[PDB]
């Protein structure tokens, strides 16, 4: 059985927590509680292949981040999680996207490119522009709603598919 270890990284709020939780859990978080470090591990088949997917979940607020560059350096690929309807979590991409880079020491990691809570309507990002961004990076961009389970698998299938290609 193949181990999968899969990081979730964004700012406070993004619904990387709900995110995770529908995925492994089948259940929409409407409460926010602000995360540390959690992990979570669940056996799927995943394009036929049996495996074992490791999943954390990081903390987005600065002052919950303590050594989050530790837990992630294990991580095989990361989920970069953003809000459709909060431009400045789309903003400071880039700022994961350099902690990534440090904590794996290489400009070449498996990464997903996730526009969250798609169901909501004061988008202020719209697809395009995270397409573009996403394409910089040599990426997929996937929009899910941890709420609706919209893309929720696709993502973390995704990222899955990209860590095989590397
Ligand atoms: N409508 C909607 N709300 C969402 C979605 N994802 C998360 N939320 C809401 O957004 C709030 C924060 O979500 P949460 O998963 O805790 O965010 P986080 O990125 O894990 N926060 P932190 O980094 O502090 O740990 C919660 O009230 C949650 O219900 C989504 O897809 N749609
Ligand atoms: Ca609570
Ligand atoms: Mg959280
Ligand atoms: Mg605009």
């Given at each position: 059985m193949?181990?999968?270890?899969?990081?979730?990284?964004?700012?406070?709020?993004?619904?990387?927590?709900?995110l995770?939780?529908?995925?492994?859990?089948?259940?929409?978080?409407?409460?926010?509680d602000?995360?540390?470090?959690?992990?979570?591990?669940?056996?799927?088949?995943?394009?036929?292949?049996?495996?074992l997917?490791?999943?954390?979940?990081?903390?987005?607020?600065?002052?919950?981040?303590?050594?989050?560059?530790?837990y992630?350096?294990?991580?095989?690929?990361?989920?970069?999680?953003?809000?459709?309807?909060?431009?400045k979590?789309?903003?400071?991409?880039?700022?994961?996207?350099?902690?990534?880079?440090?904590?794996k020491?290489?400009?070449?990691?498996?990464?997903?490119?996730?526009?969250?809570?798609?169901?909501?309507?004061?988008?202020?990002?719209?697809?395009?522009?995270?397409?573009?961004?996403?394409?910089?990076?040599?990426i997929?961009?996937?929009?899910?709603?941890?709420?609706?389970?919209?893309?929720?698998?696709?993502?973390?299938?995704?990222?899955?598919?990209?860590?095989?290609?590397?």
């Amino acid at each position: 059985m193949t181990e999968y270890k899969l990081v979730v990284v964004g700012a406070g709020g993004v619904g990387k927590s709900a995110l995770t939780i529908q995925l492994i859990q089948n259940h929409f978080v409407d409460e926010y509680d602000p995360t540390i470090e959690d992990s979570y591990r669940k056996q799927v088949v995943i394009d036929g292949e049996t495996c074992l997917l490791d999943i954390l979940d990081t903390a987005g607020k600065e002052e919950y981040s303590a050594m989050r560059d530790q837990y992630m350096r294990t991580g095989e690929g990361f989920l970069c999680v953003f809000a459709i309807n909060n431009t400045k979590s789309f903003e400071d991409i880039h700022q994961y996207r350099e902690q990534i880079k440090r904590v794996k020491d290489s400009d070449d990691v498996p990464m997903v490119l996730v526009g969250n809570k798609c169901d909501l309507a004061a988008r202020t990002v719209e697809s395009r522009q995270a397409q573009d961004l996403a394409r910089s990076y040599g990426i997929p961009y996937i929009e899910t709603s941890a709420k609706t389970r919209q893309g929720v698998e696709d993502a973390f299938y995704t990222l899955v598919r990209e860590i095989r290609q590397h």
